[PDB]
């Protein structure tokens, strides 16, 4: 059945690993252990009766693997651009990521922005409408997710996968 590669991209500690863990194993680890070695996961979804194998590449947020993370753009097909709603600096840094993808990844790559840590509204620094407006500016999808609270985690991955399926099916 169909195989889609997926990139989780963002600053260190936005919750990329936790987002993949909630998608893969429907669980949450309150601990923060930074990703060093880029590791992929296969998560099988069903879109309109078709099984699609999502090869999800969980990249390291640390600056010393920027050059290493970028190398994984080849054949990526889809990229989750994750920032932390409680961290404007991470949100400011997704502009840099989106720009890097436009220049270095293929034109037909599908992009979505996730406002992660959406459950923690108390420490919110980034308004939902500021993420929506940025997504609108670049003409890409956006939704607020919580890996901890399991909000829009499946929805985000099904939304992105559909946009990849739609472009792929239209080639015929
Ligand atoms: N409240 C809350 N905390 C979250 C959520 N997602 C992740 N976190 C927390 O944020 C921290 C970083 O999560 P992690 O998945 O390791 O982030 P990362 O972006 O993969 N980090 P790195 O790029 O360095 O590997 C952890 O303490 C984790 O529990 C979420 O949806 N809600
Ligand atoms: Mg990670």
Numbering used by the authors: 6 to 177
What does the paper say about this structure?
Upon attachment to their target membranes, Rab GTPases act as molecular switches that are activated by a GEF that catalyzes the exchange of the bound guanosine-5′-diphosphate (GDP) for the more abundant guanosine-5′-triphosphate (GTP). Once active, the GTP-bound Rab can interact with specific effector proteins which mediate a variety of downstream functions including binding to cargoes, enabling vesicle formation and promoting vesicle fusion to target membranes. Rabs are inactivated by GAPs that promote the hydrolysis of GTP to GDP and the inactive Rab is then relocalized to the cytosol. Structural analysis of Rab8A revealed that the PINK1-regulated Ser111 site lies within a short stretch of amino acids within the C-terminal region termed the RabSF3 motif.
To understand the mechanism by which Ser111 phosphorylation impacts on its interactions with its GEF, GAP and LRRK2, we solved the structure of pSer111-Rab8A. Employing genetic code expansion technologies for the incorporation of pSer65 into Ubiquitin, we were able to produce pSer111-Rab8A in the inactive GDP-bound conformation (pSer111-Rab8A:GDP) and the active GTP-bound conformation (pSer111-Rab8A:GppNHp) with a yield of 0.15 mg/l of bacterial culture. Phosphorylated Rab8A exhibits a typical small GTPase fold with highly flexible Switch regions in the GDP-bound form, and well-defined structured Switch regions in the GppNHp-bound form. The pSer111 residue is located C-terminal of helix α3 in a loop above the Switch II region (α2). The superimposed structures of pSer111-Rab8A and WT-Rab8A showed that the phosphorylation at Ser111 does not impact the overall structure of Rab8A. The phosphorylation at Ser111 did not induce any major changes in the structure of Rab8A, nor in Rab1B, despite impacting on GEF/GAP interactions. To determine whether Ser111 phosphorylation was mediating specific effects via the Switch II domain we determined the binding affinity of WT- and pSer111-Rab8A GppNHp-bound forms with the effector Mical-1, which binds outside the Switch II domain. Using ITC, we obtained a KD value of 923 nM for the binding affinity of WT-Rab8A and Mical-1, and a KD of 913 nM for pSer111 Rab8A with Mical-1, suggesting that the phosphorylation at Ser111 has no effect on Rab8-Mical-1 effector interaction. Furthermore, we did not detect any influence of Ser111 phosphorylation on the interaction with the effector Mical-1 because the Switch II region (α2) of Rab8A is not part of the Mical-1 binding site. Strikingly, we found that the ability of LRRK2 [G2019S] to phosphorylate pSer111-Rab8A:GDP was disrupted (compared with WT-Rab8A:GDP) and a similar reduction was determined for pSer111-Rab8A:GppNHp (compared with WT-Rab8A:GppNHp).
